[PDB]
């Protein structure tokens, strides 16, 4: 049972899923059907949801994943697709604008794997 969520649109709502791959702060681990209740933060990556055998992949903004005792998954982020998804004016105007600015280095890490 998956429950993918976003502030503007809900994707899943108690729907039955076989396996979901969540990009935790550690490594992209696939959550089993009866996986142990854990609470780990999700860094921007790819979320694969397996409906039976069909493959669905979304690119995630970044939020929190939570396995409940009732083997229920709670995935949340700001904005989640792949068929709907170049910005390089940040490696100079942003990357070297060191004096929002001093921390303008998270931008590069996001887009690099977006192409992936």
């Amino acid at each position: 049972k998956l429950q993918f969520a976003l502030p503007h649109e809900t994707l899943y709502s108690g729907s039955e899923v076989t396996q979901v791959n969540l990009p935790a702060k550690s490594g992209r681990i696939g959550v089993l059907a009866n996986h142990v209740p854990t609470v780990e933060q999700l860094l921007p990556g790819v979320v694969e949801v397996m409906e039976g055998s069909n493959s669905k992949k979304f690119f995630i903004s970044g939020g929190f994943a939570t396995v409940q005792p009732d083997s229920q998954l709670c995935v949340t982020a700001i904005e989640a697709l792949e068929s709907f998804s170049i910005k390089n004016l940040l490696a100079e105007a942003k990357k070297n604008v060191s004096s929002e600015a001093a921390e303008a280095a998270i931008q590069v890490e996001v887009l690099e794997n977006l192409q992936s």
Binding site: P7, E9, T10, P37, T38, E40, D70, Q72
Partner: protein, 268 residues
């Protein structure tokens, strides 16, 4: 009485009649986004609170941070009226508290009743539908300039659309880093004691619960603005037509009196 004053007074009401009706459509056609962002937020709210439920998180055993959620735009009804009282009434029990106000029309009642309590206020937000970026930044300041992490209790005050014709002042709690890991059923979930999860969980639930509060808050408002201006266009009717008759009662009397002087001065 004046030849013109009753015509230009009929104008400043004839166009006020259409303007309240034109904003009624704006509020009624914007109810679509309101009844959507409301359900989307709530659904993420369940996904976000289910951990807080199965973990059995609750406030520890005199600081408390109060967040007021409304807009700067008026013409919406008693939404800025009843919510400000709900805050004031909740503030009475614990005068020892700091209040952050989102929107100016909420800063009104609070500047009157408890002027010193307000330590921070957000300006010019309530006009569109809320966004994460907006809230995440409000929480970023709430966290920085206000140091919310040093508070034992967080409370968000917002409006909850119970019905499509009536709203409802409500309150939700936000738990800090220390209150999360010290939860009774917190060990129930496997968590690596090093990656500051409880800390990141609070700073993240601080932004979301705001947006969830805003989403329903600015949804109950749009649903209340349509109501507020449907009664307005109707009330503008008992004016455009009331003074309309008074214009004619003056026009007929103008042509007659203007003609009497001519006939009187023609008899010689």
């Amino acid at each position: 009485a004046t030849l013109k004053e009753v015509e230009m007074r009929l104008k400043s009401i004839k166009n006020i009649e259409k303007i309240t009706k034109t904003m009624k459509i704006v509020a009624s056609t914007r109810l679509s986004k309101a009844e959507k962002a409301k359900i989307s937020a709530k659904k993420m709210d369940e996904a976000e609170q289910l951990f807080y439920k199965n973990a059995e998180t609750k406030n520890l055993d005199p600081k408390e941070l109060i967040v007021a959620i409304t807009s700067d735009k008026g013409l919406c009804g008693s939404i800025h009226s009843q919510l400000a009282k709900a805050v004031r009434r909740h503030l009475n029990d614990q005068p020892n508290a700091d209040i952050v106000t989102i929107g100016d029309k909420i800063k009104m009642q609070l500047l009157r009743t408890h002027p010193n309590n307000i330590k921070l206020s957000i300006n010019g937000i309530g006009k569109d539908a809320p966004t994460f970026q907006e809230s995440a930044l409000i929480a970023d300041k709430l966290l920085s300039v206000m140091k919310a992490g040093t508070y034992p209790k967080i409370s968000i005050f917002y409006n909850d659309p119970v019905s499509s014709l009536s709203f409802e002042p409500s309150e939700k709690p936000i738990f800090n880093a220390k209150t999360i890991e010290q939860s009774p059923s917190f060990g129930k979930f496997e968590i690596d004691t090093d990656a500051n999860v409880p800390r990141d969980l609070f700073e993240y639930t601080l932004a979301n619960q705001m947006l969830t509060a805003m989403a329903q808050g600015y949804a109950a408002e749009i649903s209340a603005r349509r109501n507020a201006m449907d009664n307005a266009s109707k009330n503008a009717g008992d004016m455009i037509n009331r003074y309309s008759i008074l214009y004619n009662r003056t026009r007929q009397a103008v042509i007659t009196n203007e003609l009497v002087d001519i006939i009187t001065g023609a008899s010689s």
